[PDB]
From a paper:
Tweety homologs (TTYHs) are conserved transmembrane proteins present in all eukaryotes including three members (TTYH1, [name], and [name]) in humans. TTYHs have been reported to form Ca2+- and cell volume-regulated anion channels structurally distinct from any characterized protein family with potential roles in cell adhesion, migration, and developmental signaling. Each protomer consists of five transmembrane helices (TM1–5) and an extracellular domain (ED) which extends 75 Å from the membrane surface between an extracellular N-terminus and intracellular C-terminus. We conclude TTYHs are not pore forming subunits of anion channels and their function may involve Ca2+-dependent changes in quaternary structure, interactions with hydrophobic molecules near the extracellular membrane surface, and/or association with additional protein partners.
Residue numbers in the entry:
A (entry chain B): 39 to 71, 89 to 414
B (entry chain A): 5 to 73, 89 to 414
The structure:
């Protein structure tokens, strides 16, 4: 497709540049066949190592901030589903069992049958409203897949770049020791190692540039991409709300939440009336009605927590933290690492050009 | 079981062969205004007139024979007339008591129906006006919290159901009007009949005393010119026998099938089922109002449970709403006590007892009164016939 075009072209351009550098080095070597230069090379190598370490630490910080934000937006999408499941299970099992028990107890008098039927219908309305809330089990799994795969990839890349930094430090120390030891032949015969580290630096620059351009593209219009990837799988209204949380935007769950809370209030008023007028009736029903009000109290508290949880402020803040982290920090770190790789390539080219000259 | 049973005398009286005016069989179907039944009843008057004519011509023949071809007869005639007047007075008092028993029973039934209608009207007006006004005030007060709109609407729907159920109760205005009219008519007719027959008894006693004085005064001409009055009172006695026999036959026909006729009278203004229930109930019937009363009292229970719950959970809101909510519970208390009184009223025991009192006061009392009054008429006719027969023979 046209999306792969930029990445593939940049990769092939970097590969062709590395090949051209190798051919030029071979031509220079076949054509061929200082303390100040040494300190200059050491200073440039130290500067490149510092730049690379800072960029790698920056990218590490950013890609663990991204994982933290993913795991803090995953916990909310799990607690919300837990609350919805708990409320649905409660009203489906405990309330129905208790109301059936109460009806069996006080079926002797048929006046309260009408209000018991009305409260049964209100419980059914509550269950229907609760089922209307979206299930996040298809987004939680996605945020687990990302939170695991990105962590693994970041750890592997971090280990690889620490290995590269260690190799560069080792080669610099070996060069310094060889210079101090009057340029031992075996010590100074590391032209193959120089070629290998130069091609590794070129490949690192290629990968850094490819990742930088890819993340820049995916940060150019992040909302559209996230809507086309997962926002299409789920209802687009909820994604629209969570993404661009704003005061002007009307909440998508306000109607369902207000109907559910009104139904809870109506059930509470029926239960209170039954409690007050059940004193003339058998007091064994008040034992069950106390459980009914316990269920209603717990449901009201859970609903208040849930409506404090669907609020777009927290999710929008977590999403913005994740986006700022990945985009800004990763772009800065990858640019720093690309500069590091360019510095290493130039230093290695200069060393190769001045290798036989010093020898 | 307590119920209406036809006594032997009323069925025996009904057992006489009914005839039309032209001597042809007529059915015993009771019909106060129908032509054939009115003619059948007038046939008894015609027969009594024929009997009076036969007695008059026989007496004339006897007097002519004894004139052309002394105090024992006068004493016998006077004693027989006195006994006849005694029997007539007893019968008249008995049937007067029967008619006023009917009047009292009708007034009692009318009062119960009026109370029923008043309770229904009061409850319907209360639900239409007071509950709705108080609910409007309460909604205006607590519109700040939008949750209670659902329960207010539900209990307003309960109010609509209550009004619809109450409107289904029968309206007794027509029945009360009919009962009042019938009571007025019965009181008027009974008073006039009682006064007329006391007048007749007094006139007969005066004629007997005049006979005694004339006999004791050696047949004074001014006390011997009483034969005209004697003939007039004899024909009056025969007309009284006509009227007594006619009324006895009519009321025996009624008493043969009382409940069927009562159902026929008001078989369209009100549902026939409730009329049948009031007329016939000894142990237990379907009680057609029971379903409506149960649904209405259930609706009141839901009313009051909504109001109690709203009272309990409206104290977090300012208690200004309680000034209306306690009034609402006052309305529900009054409605519940009124409904209990009403369901006590709709029980068929009271109305059936009133109906059975009216039916006994007619069947078992007026029939005997009319029978003894007809016996008075026969005895007075015979006594005055003998007295006139002994008139010319005395001198
Ligand atoms: C991201 O969210 C998912 C679910 O939305 C989380 O997965 C769930 O994690 C909990 C607790 O870690 C699991 O409960 C328990 O897991 C243990 C295994 O550690 C198991 O032996 C217990 O029986 C119990 O199930 C739960 O199973 C798991 N899965 C689901 C579908 O709820 C996850 O922890 C969150 N964080 C990350 C980084 O993925
Ligand atoms: C028998 O029951 C009735 C029902 O309550 C008692 O009230 C009387 O109801 C009749 C209805 O036919 C009233 O007659 C009407 O009076 C109005 C004037 O108010 C007149 O315009 C109509 O044309 C009709 O005649 C009657 O007035 C009313 N009586 C009273 C005192 O309110 C009735 O009293 C009961 N009968 C007895 C003897 O208690």
């Amino acid at each position: 497709e046209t999306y792969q075009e930029s990445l593939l072209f940049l990769g092939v351009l970097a590969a062709i540049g590395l090949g051209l550098n190798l051919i030029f080095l071979t031509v220079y070597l076949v054509c061929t066949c200082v303390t100040w230069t040494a300190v200059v090379a050491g200073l440039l190598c130290c500067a490149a190592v510092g730049v690379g370490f800072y960029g790698n630490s920056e990218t590490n910080d950013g890609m663990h901030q991204l994982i933290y934000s993913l795991d803090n937006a995953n916990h909310t999408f799990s607690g919300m589903d837990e609350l919805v499941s708990a409320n649905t299970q409660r009203m489906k099992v405990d309330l129905e069992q208790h109301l059936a028990r109460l009806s069996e107890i006080i079926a002797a008098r048929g006046d309260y049958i009408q209000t018991l039927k009305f409260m049964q219908q209100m419980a059914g309305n509550v269950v229907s409203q609760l089922s209307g809330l979206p299930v996040w089990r298809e987004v939680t799994t996605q945020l687990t897949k990302l939170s695991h795969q990105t962590a693994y990839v970041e750890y592997y890349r971090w280990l690889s770049y620490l290995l590269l930094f260690i190799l560069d430090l080792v080669i610099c120390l070996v060069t310094c020791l060889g210079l101090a030891r009057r340029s031992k032949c075996l010590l100074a015969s590391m032209l193959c190692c120089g070629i290998l580290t130069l091609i590794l630096s070129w490949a690192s620059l290629a990968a850094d540039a490819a990742a930088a351009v890819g993340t820049s593209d995916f940060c150019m219009a992040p909302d559209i991409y996230i809507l086309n990837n997962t926002g299409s799988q789920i209802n687009s209204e909820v994604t629209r709300y969570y993404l661009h949380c704003s005061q002007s935007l009307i909440s998508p769950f306000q109607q369902s939440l207000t109907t559910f809370q009104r139904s809870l209030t109506t059930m509470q008023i029926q239960v209170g009336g039954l409690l007050q007028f059940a004193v003339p009736l058998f007091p064994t029903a008040e034992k069950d009605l106390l459980g009914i009000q316990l269920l209603l109290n717990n449901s009201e508290i859970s609903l208040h927590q849930l409506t404090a949880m669907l609020d777009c402020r927290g999710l929008h803040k977590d999403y913005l933290d994740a986006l700022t982290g990945i985009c800004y920090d990763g772009i800065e770190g990858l640019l720093f690492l690309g500069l590091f790789s360019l510095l290493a390539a130039l230093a290695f080219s200069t060393l190769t050009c001045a290798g036989p000259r010093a020898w």
